[PDB]
Every structure is written in C-alpha cells, then in structure tokens.
Design an enzyme around this catalytic site. Sequence first.
Site, PDB file in Angstrom:
ATOM      1  N   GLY B  23       0.845  -1.181   0.000  1.00 30.79           N
ATOM      2  CA  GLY B  23       0.000   0.000   0.000  1.00 30.79           C
ATOM      3  C   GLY B  23       0.876   1.225   0.000  1.00 30.79           C
ATOM      4  O   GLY B  23       2.045   1.161  -0.412  1.00 30.79           O
ATOM      5  N   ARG B 143      -9.711   0.375  -5.709  1.00 36.08           N
ATOM      6  CA  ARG B 143      -8.458  -0.167  -5.112  1.00 36.08           C
ATOM      7  C   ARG B 143      -8.264   0.223  -3.646  1.00 36.08           C
ATOM      8  O   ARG B 143      -7.574  -0.462  -2.913  1.00 36.08           O
ATOM      9  CB  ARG B 143      -7.220   0.224  -5.932  1.00 36.08           C
ATOM     10  N   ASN B 144      -8.897   1.320  -3.223  1.00 29.22           N
ATOM     11  CA  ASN B 144      -8.750   1.862  -1.860  1.00 29.22           C
ATOM     12  C   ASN B 144     -10.023   1.744  -1.023  1.00 29.22           C
ATOM     13  O   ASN B 144     -10.141   2.328   0.075  1.00 29.22           O
ATOM     14  CB  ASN B 144      -8.284   3.322  -1.913  1.00 29.22           C
TER      15      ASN B 144
HETATM   16  C1  D94 Z   1      -3.298  -1.571  -5.817  1.00 25.14           C
HETATM   17  N1  D94 Z   1      -3.474  -1.874  -4.353  1.00 25.14           N
HETATM   18  C2  D94 Z   1      -2.135  -2.132  -3.701  1.00 25.14           C
HETATM   19  C3  D94 Z   1      -2.342  -2.422  -2.217  1.00 25.14           C
HETATM   20  N2  D94 Z   1      -3.267  -3.548  -1.989  1.00 25.14           N
HETATM   21  C4  D94 Z   1      -3.337  -4.120  -0.606  1.00 25.14           C
HETATM   22  C5  D94 Z   1      -2.826  -3.199   0.535  1.00 25.14           C
HETATM   23  C6  D94 Z   1      -3.708  -4.106   1.437  1.00 25.14           C
HETATM   24  C7  D94 Z   1      -4.383  -3.501   2.668  1.00 25.14           C
HETATM   25  N3  D94 Z   1      -4.323  -2.225   3.014  1.00 25.14           N
HETATM   26  C8  D94 Z   1      -5.048  -2.098   4.179  1.00 25.14           C
HETATM   27  C9  D94 Z   1      -5.249  -0.767   4.708  1.00 25.14           C
HETATM   28  C10 D94 Z   1      -6.580  -0.391   4.949  1.00 25.14           C
HETATM   29  C11 D94 Z   1      -6.921   0.891   5.382  1.00 25.14           C
HETATM   30  C12 D94 Z   1      -5.892   1.854   5.527  1.00 25.14           C
HETATM   31  C13 D94 Z   1      -6.174   3.156   5.957  1.00 25.14           C
HETATM   32  C14 D94 Z   1      -5.134   4.083   6.079  1.00 25.14           C
HETATM   33  C15 D94 Z   1      -3.822   3.700   5.769  1.00 25.14           C
HETATM   34  C16 D94 Z   1      -2.677   4.627   5.928  1.00 25.14           C
HETATM   35  C17 D94 Z   1      -1.512   4.180   6.588  1.00 25.14           C
HETATM   36  C18 D94 Z   1      -0.405   5.003   6.788  1.00 25.14           C
HETATM   37  C19 D94 Z   1      -0.448   6.320   6.362  1.00 25.14           C
HETATM   38  C20 D94 Z   1      -1.591   6.807   5.715  1.00 25.14           C
HETATM   39  C21 D94 Z   1      -2.692   5.969   5.504  1.00 25.14           C
HETATM   40  N4  D94 Z   1      -3.522   2.421   5.364  1.00 25.14           N
HETATM   41  C22 D94 Z   1      -4.532   1.520   5.235  1.00 25.14           C
HETATM   42  C23 D94 Z   1      -4.243   0.217   4.795  1.00 25.14           C
HETATM   43  C24 D94 Z   1      -5.588  -3.324   4.539  1.00 25.14           C
HETATM   44  C25 D94 Z   1      -6.425  -3.843   5.626  1.00 25.14           C
HETATM   45  N5  D94 Z   1      -6.912  -3.017   6.620  1.00 25.14           N
HETATM   46  N6  D94 Z   1      -6.743  -5.125   5.656  1.00 25.14           N
HETATM   47  C26 D94 Z   1      -6.264  -5.959   4.662  1.00 25.14           C
HETATM   48  C27 D94 Z   1      -5.491  -5.559   3.629  1.00 25.14           C
HETATM   49  N7  D94 Z   1      -5.144  -4.210   3.564  1.00 25.14           N
HETATM   50  C28 D94 Z   1      -4.653  -4.124   0.201  1.00 25.14           C
HETATM   51  C29 D94 Z   1      -4.597  -3.297  -2.590  1.00 25.14           C
HETATM   52  C30 D94 Z   1      -4.495  -2.962  -4.084  1.00 25.14           C
END
Ligand code: D94
Lengths: 289, 289
Positions: B23, B143-144
């Site tokens: 991410g 994606r987010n």
């Molecule tokens: C093209 N993309 C590339 C990344 N891919 C992955 C990253 C992964 C993921 N990420 C999270 C998650 C979920 C919510 C968030 C909310 C905020 C932030 C964040 C962190 C640090 C600084 C700023 C924002 N990070 C977060 C991270 C989460 C999660 N909460 N549960 C499971 C998987 N997650 C899914 C998806 C497709």
Amino acid sequence: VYVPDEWEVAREKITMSRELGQGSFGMVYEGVAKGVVKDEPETRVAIKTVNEAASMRERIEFLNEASVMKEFNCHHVVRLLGVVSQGQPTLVIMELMTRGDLKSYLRSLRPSLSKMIQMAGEIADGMAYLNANKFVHRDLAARNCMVAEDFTVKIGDFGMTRDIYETDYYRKGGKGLLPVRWMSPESLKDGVFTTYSDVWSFGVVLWEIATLAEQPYQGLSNEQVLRFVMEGGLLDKPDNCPDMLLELMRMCWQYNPKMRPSFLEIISSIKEEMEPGFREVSFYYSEEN
Amino acid sequence: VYVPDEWEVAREKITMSRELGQGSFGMVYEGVAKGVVKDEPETRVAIKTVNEAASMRERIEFLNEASVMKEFNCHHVVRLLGVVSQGQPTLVIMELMTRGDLKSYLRSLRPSLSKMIQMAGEIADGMAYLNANKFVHRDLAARNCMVAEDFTVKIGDFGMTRDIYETDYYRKGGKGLLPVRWMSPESLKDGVFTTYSDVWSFGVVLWEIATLAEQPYQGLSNEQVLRFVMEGGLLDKPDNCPDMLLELMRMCWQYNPKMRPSFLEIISSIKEEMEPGFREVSFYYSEEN
Ligand SMILES: CN1CCN([C@H]2C[C@@H](c3nc(-c4ccc5ccc(-c6ccccc6)nc5c4)c4c(N)nccn43)C2)CC1
Ligand SMILES: CN1CCN([C@H]2C[C@@H](c3nc(-c4ccc5ccc(-c6ccccc6)nc5c4)c4c(N)nccn43)C2)CC1
Ligand SMILES: [Ca+2]
Ligand SMILES: [Ca+2]
C-alpha cells in the site's frame, strides 16, 4: 512495438520460486530456465516480471530497455539470457547473481585492500565495457552492482531512471525518479547523464565500498544534497580508507566532467593490484579493447 | 516528531504472517495482535510496515498521516487499532479486511442491483463520515475501498498521495503521484482536492462497480485523460447499468464542483434501497449526524 526474435523463450521452459526483490519495472524471482546456456539442460536464473496490471506501454518499454543487453557480452556486466514477450507476465531472464546486490552485501559485513581493489576494477571494467558500447548506465550505485557465487562484482539494473510508469498514478510533468546522492553536479543541474557522470557515480560506489554502504551525505535532506553538491561539496573521506581508493574517489569527483578519468584509465592505474584471472575475463585486456 | 500515546502497542504482542500487498508507505501483512479490541485476548489484524531502509522523515510522516485515524470511529471506515512507533519496523495496526480491496474483488466476479446499491451506500456513508470530520480522502478508488468478512465495503488507504518518499530517489520538484483517472476537472487543473472532488471520485467508483473494475478511460493515455476530462469529457455509461447508479454517476460528474451532491444527499436518495441493518451501523442515521 516489440518484435520477437531469437532471444524468445517458451514459457513452459521457465519455473520461478522465491522473490529476490523489486527492481525497476517489477519483481525479480529466482527460477530455472531450460535451454538458455550452452551445454546445460537447465540454468538457475533471475527472472524480472512486469505485472499483469501494468500498462501495455510500460510492458513494451520494459522489453525495449532490456533489449539493449542483447548486444552485451561482458564478464562484469550481468548477462541477459532470454525474454518471454508472449503472454502474462512479461519476463526478462538473466544471469543469476546468487549473493544479491552489493549494497546489501556490504551492509552484511558491518573487506581488505586487496578485495576492495578487485571489486573496484571489476566494476570499472563492466563500466568501461558499457561506455565503449555507447551505453550510459545513469544509475551506478552499490544497490545496482551485483555479487556472483565466487564474489565477482558485476554491473546490474540500469532501469530505475528509465521506468517512469506507475499503473494508476501519474506524475504531473511525466518525469521520473533521480538518484541524487549518486549524481554529478552537472546532472543535478540539467538532468543529462554522460560517460563522465557515470564516473562520478563510480567514486560514490568506492565510498560505499569503503564505508560498508553508509548513506551518502548521511545527515542532509535531499534538497540539501542538491545544493551542497552543486556548490562543489564532497563526501567525507572514510575512516581507514587506503590512499589509493581515496585518490580514485577524488579524481572521480572533479567538478569539471572533462577532468575525471575514463574507466579504462581507472583500470590502468590499478591493474597491478588485480588478480591474474582478471587478464583472462576482463574487457580491459580483451581483443575488443 | 511523533509523540507516543495510548495507541502504542508493545511489539511482543504482534506477530505477522503473509503479505497482503504494498500500500502507501509500505507492505501490509496479515497478523495477530494481543489486547487491541475490547473483550478478546487477540485479534487478527492488518499490519502496514515502513521499511528499515526508509528515511526517518518518511517514517514520521507515516505515523502522522495514520494518526488522523485516532479520531475516526465509523463502521464504514477501516479502523486503526494501534501503532508501534518504537523500534524497527515502524508499524500501523488496522482492522483486517479479509476479502481485500474492492477493485480485486470486482475483477474476481468477471453483482445485482440490490448488492450494487448497498455497496454504494456503504462507501458514501464512510465518506460522509470522513468529510464531516473535516477529512478529504483525495484517493477514493475501488483499489482503496476494502471488503470485510461479511462483504461490507469500507473506506481504506488514503496515503498514496501523501507518501512522497522514495528512499534513494528524489523527484525534481518534490511532488507526488496523482490518481488522474479518478480526479475531478478542477483537481487536474490546480492539484487541490476537496469534499467535492471526493464526490467526483465516488462516481468513478460506482462506474468501477458497474463495469466490474474496468480501467477508467480504457483507451486513452494519461496525457489524453487530462485533456479529455478537463474539457468536460465523461466516462461511457456501463452496459446494463441500472438507471439509479447511472443517475448518481452523472450527478457526481457535474463539471462545476458546487453542483455535485454531498455524500449525505447521495445516501438520502438511496436510503429506501439499503438493508435495515444500515440504520444501526451507519453514520447517516447515527446520533453524530
Ligand atoms: C493496488 N493496491 C495495492 C495495495 N493492496 C493491498 C494493501 C492491502 C491492505 N491495506 C489495508 C489498509 C486499509 C486501510 C488503511 C487506511 C489508512 C492507511 C494509511 C496508513 C499510513 C499512512 C496513511 C494511511 N492504510 C490503510 C491500509 C488493509 C487492511 N486493513 N486489511 C487488509 C489488507 N489491507 C490491500 C490493494 C491494491
Ligand atoms: C534496492 N534494490 C531493490 C532491488 N533489489 C533486488 C532486485 C534483484 C535483482 N535484480 C537483478 C537484475 C540484474 C541485472 C539487471 C540488468 C538490467 C535490468 C533491466 C531490466 C528491464 C529493463 C531495464 C533494465 N534488470 C536487471 C536485474 C538480479 C539478478 N540478475 N540476479 C539476482 C537478483 N537480481 C536485486 C536490490 C536492492
Ligand atoms: Ca514502474
Ligand atoms: Ca514511499
């Protein structure tokens, strides 16, 4: 547009195992390739992939930038072994460098003058070769030098400055990442890279070797590095750094590009310090030179 | 500078297993955290890490951008559970979204009007919540958005536009990646993001839902998308897209920001179509609203 040729490998001949790290254009894997080297049914290989998600444009540039290596044949430049341009993922097959990148290798020791000089000359030889083949690397750094089974250093990834592609994101002007702590004062000014700025980076690599991969300009932000270097600022001399490597860094870091030695001249000045083996494998003593 | 507080978790309470994807700021892992949720010895969690190699600056911004989530308490925004600011790697602990990102989920089906509308309202509710808490996401895209165990959609990663840090590379001006196919005409022009441009992106998400995650502006380069959208160009209407979601996209894509509905208004217009459950968990029907 990429046109398939003799470098094309059938995908069934390829297996991939563990990740080796994200380079330019994508992930590198250890794998096995059938029929890529003379006189062996199979070879352990490094395979760089471009993601299925990636744009067709990135995918084409991946192949075109890699295809420059089809002309290369040097003991001290990591060899291209093959390409898979049909299907997904798009693959570049390369000589496996089993000890990984030089930076990580250096960090892991945290060598002797004889070993430091052999590395120096190996890197300079790969670079002399590339520069003689009209190729400017643009990203010479210890992270982009690679270590073989027998500890031979070779020139690796040149793609980082050429990969300007992010799949769903776009930088305003369209420009890319620049390795500012490895760049010459003139390249910091106008963004053009030359043979002479590669030599500048070589001095930084020697400094990285002499400090066991310290961060160049350790205490300064990126904006401060730009200013410092463009105003003639230079890296501190490493502790207990043998005079010969100190002398080489200093020649490499002449502010005026035309006043730096060539890579052939660098090798020339340290050839008495190289392994006898160097004479048989190097571009320097080769018929080509 | 980051100041540790009550959100701090001891590292021994954390284990990590498999990678979930890169991410913003770094790699996300599935893991287990002790003592992060009320009335359970342990919780399966998502853990985002900042690399050991990363600069102290990135590492601090990681924590500061994530710390905005300390104020958030919404069923439709992925919750922050804790932080590990001491030692390496720097960790952000979050609610685990076991079905991954919405884009990948959509691709995997390649839903019904009832399910499409429930997703719509869930996303709009998380966004209504964030916008009411003075937060602009700036990177709303499928994606987010994330999918829970029970298929509830929630708002995820906002860091991609805020993470301008690459460890050994530096982009000339210092700017970052921009999600141009999800951005409003006014944001493409001056790079500022608002409540209204989040609503623009919401329409793009509905289009992504309606096309099972097709690429927005499928046939156009990034430079062509800039021009097209800034000249009032709009996404094609999806095949067999129910009129209600078509109507919503069109309202979200009014050229003039002030003419788009708010998120509360979007929910208001589709509330008759939501699960009875929505009334109990949503910010919309909450005391806060
Ligand atoms: C093209 N993309 C590339 C990344 N891919 C992955 C990253 C992964 C993921 N990420 C999270 C998650 C979920 C919510 C968030 C909310 C905020 C932030 C964040 C962190 C640090 C600084 C700023 C924002 N990070 C977060 C991270 C989460 C999660 N909460 N549960 C499971 C998987 N997650 C899914 C998806 C497709
Ligand atoms: C901060 N860094 C992040 C990346 N890290 C990993 C990438 C991995 C690696 N890369 C290669 C390898 C070695 C030589 C190359 C030479 C050229 C290109 C290239 C490919 C496509 C387009 C342009 C250039 N890729 C190359 C890739 C190789 C290799 N040949 N053998 C083993 C590992 N390798 C080491 C190191 C540290
Ligand atoms: Ca890329
Ligand atoms: Ca980053």
